[PDB]
Amino acid sequence: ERLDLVNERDEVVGQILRTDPALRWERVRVVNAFLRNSQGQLWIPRRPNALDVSVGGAVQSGETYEEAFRREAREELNVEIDALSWRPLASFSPFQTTLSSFMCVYELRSDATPIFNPNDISGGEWLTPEHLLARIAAGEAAKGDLAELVRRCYR
């Protein structure tokens, strides 16, 4: 429930409670990841009726980006990142883009559909970035940074 506070250089300068009313997302770190198969499709869950990244969540105080990634992947998708191929896709700053927080975006490789945790995900589907962006453009519900992450990370 506690998060690290970071400056413009993504350097830790303090801590804050996740539920603190003074919380500012541009002052904290999150992780986001996309699961992509050999068909070039991304597994997009519905989180729960809005489209979202395959795996995503805030980095806990004292935690590194990779550790947060491993944690969210297992709690949301029941996936062990160490059991699959993955890599840092990109890193972004909230002041250099229109993304909400400082973040590291990863890409997980797998052709298997995840045995996701139903508590936060109602279902998911393999979608091409083109079709996904089209739905967002149409007005279908989606996390605020999903479209930008897809565009910045994939062409």
Swiss-Prot record:
GO terms for molecular function: hydrolase activity; magnesium ion binding; nucleotide binding. It is an enzyme of class 3 (hydrolase). InterPro entries: NUDIX_hydrolase-like_dom_sf (IPR015797), NUDIX_hydrolase_CS (IPR020084), NUDIX_hydrolase_dom (IPR000086). This is Nudix hydrolase DR_0079. Its cofactor is Mg(2+). Mg(2+) binds at residues 72, 76. PANTHER family: ISOPENTENYL-DIPHOSPHATE DELTA-ISOMERASE. PROSITE patterns: NUDIX, NUDIX_BOX. The lineage of its organism: Bacteria, Thermotogati, Deinococcota, Deinococci, Deinococcales. Belongs to the Nudix hydrolase family. Keywords: Hydrolase, Magnesium, Metal-binding, Nucleotide-binding. It comes from Deinococcus radiodurans (strain ATCC 13939 / DSM 20539 / JCM 16871 / CCUG 27074 / LMG 4051 / NBRC 15346 / NCIMB 9279 / VKM B-1422 / R1). GO terms for biological process: nucleotide metabolic process. The keyword Metal-binding applies.
